[PDB]
Write a protein that binds this ligand. Sequence first.
Ligand SMILES: CCN(C[C@@](O)(CNC(=O)c1cnn(-c2ccc(F)cc2)c1N)C(F)(F)F)C(=O)c1c(Cl)cccc1Cl
Ligand SMILES: CCN(C[C@@](O)(CNC(=O)c1cnn(-c2ccc(F)cc2)c1N)C(F)(F)F)C(=O)c1c(Cl)cccc1Cl
Lengths: 248, 245, 10, 11
Amino acid sequence: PQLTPTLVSLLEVIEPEVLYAGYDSSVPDSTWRIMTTLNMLGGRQVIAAVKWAKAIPGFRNLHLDDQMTLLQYSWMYLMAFALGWRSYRQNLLCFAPDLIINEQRMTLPGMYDQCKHMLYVSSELHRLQVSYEEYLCMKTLLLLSSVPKDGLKSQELFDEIRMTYIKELGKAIVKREGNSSQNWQRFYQLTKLLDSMHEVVENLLNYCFQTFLDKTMSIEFPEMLAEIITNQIPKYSNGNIKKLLFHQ
Amino acid sequence: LPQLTPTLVSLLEVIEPEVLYAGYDSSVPDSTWRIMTTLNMLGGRQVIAAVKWAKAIPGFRNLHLDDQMTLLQYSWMYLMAFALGWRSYRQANLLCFAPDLIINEQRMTLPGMYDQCKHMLYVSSELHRLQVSYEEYLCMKTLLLLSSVPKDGLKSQELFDEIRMTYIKELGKAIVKSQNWQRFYQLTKLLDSMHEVVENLLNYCFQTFLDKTMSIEFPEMLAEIITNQIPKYSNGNIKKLLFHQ
Amino acid sequence: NALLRYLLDK
Amino acid sequence: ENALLRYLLDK
Ligand SMILES: CCN(C[C@@](O)(CNC(=O)c1cnn(-c2ccc(F)cc2)c1N)C(F)(F)F)C(=O)c1c(Cl)cccc1Cl
Ligand SMILES: CCN(C[C@@](O)(CNC(=O)c1cnn(-c2ccc(F)cc2)c1N)C(F)(F)F)C(=O)c1c(Cl)cccc1Cl
């Protein structure tokens, strides 16, 4: 067998636990109440993602500012992709076992204009019937999907880690149970989806940001999350972001 | 670069079980009864966690299912004592069963407490005497899972032999991290000693289990493992693996 | 031994 | 400017 542990199997053990939103089914739903409950859970998922990123082989070995810049760039990529996966494995957005955006909730005021981006991720995963190991490798790549225009401090080591996971993904595709004549075609499809995550997140962020800035909405963001959001709004208009593409 | 090629020990870290609380009410007086009962409940939950741990150990799932059950059945208390030993080592002569259940001097002196706690204590002071590092610890704990087999053999006895040698080697790399061979003898001497430790631990545990005059609750998981075990000890169908003869 | 069996065979 | 993230990252 393989007493010699593969990278992807390590990605599997460090995968974060499922968190509950503590949402009270007994009080009637409101967009305002969901936005808030989701902000709270979200802040906690981001904290989880830090604990996750650090356990990813190679990541801790990057410069500390590198490590921060990448979580800063990618948190919503990871949130959106992990939700997509959860939802796929479940037609609903399964933010938490006790917070599923069902048909009724989907139709709440101002709700579909965000979830439909999440839904696309879920729908794409499902259409490509993406497997678990492919999902794991792909999520890691999403951590590494964006870098500063001017470059990272450990730009060299980053490139190695990222190429490493591109290969790890290739291995997952091949290892997948199907027909091998589709492998290069599948690798094309999967990175095509990774590529599409940029557009997705840009939308998710434009509606999460303006909601954060809306002085007339009174939605609570936890502190972990408010920091990142404030620190990002500048750069996201300063165009100092190189979004790495598999397909130009 | 060398990390992108992840080690066996590095995985052993990841899968290391979380710290559980005993949920022990600190504002009621103590009695040996209350502590034993709270430790049984905590322990049940520790064993269940050990199963999740074992199954994530590279190679373990590949053993025949019957073997896996046999090894957890033989070794749960090796794993309990060793993990507790480590916990305690990391912070005076107190058994740190849980952040909210630490067996202190007063507690130690409770009727019937020391007569078992000393064995846990012995594991703790050995780790401290040898200044065992965390990575030697990880490798050592995995070897305790594999420290005992049926006298007649396991069903996947060949694959067991492999896996076990793999982790003996893993321990060796941990040690290296010139007196390397001398340390290996010391650490494997500690491993061997764990048999006598657990032999005692189980007597005072089984005895408590069989005594009717002692209304004492064990959770089902444990009660099961305990009942299925008492005989095998009477029968001595258990081969204890020794690094040193 | 069913729960142990259950837990392992999961 | 993000002490929390820095804190969480640096062990
Ligand atoms: C304004 C509300 N919200 C922001 C946010 O709460 C959205 N949260 C998430 O996207 C989120 C929370 N948990 N998970 C999650 C679930 C499962 C999983 F496996 C991993 C992660 C998410 N993907 C915030 F701030 F956290 F991003 C919005 O984006 C928003 C919503 Cl939800 C509706 C309408 C408008 C907006 Cl801006
Ligand atoms: C009869 C009471 N007891 C049995 C037992 O409760 C002991 N529990 C443990 O040894 C135990 C519980 N949690 N951990 C633990 C703590 C930290 C950690 F990281 C890992 C594990 C243990 N090692 C049972 F059932 F679990 F075995 C006794 O052995 C006993 C006692 Cl405690 C006193 C007097 C007499 C006996 Cl028989």
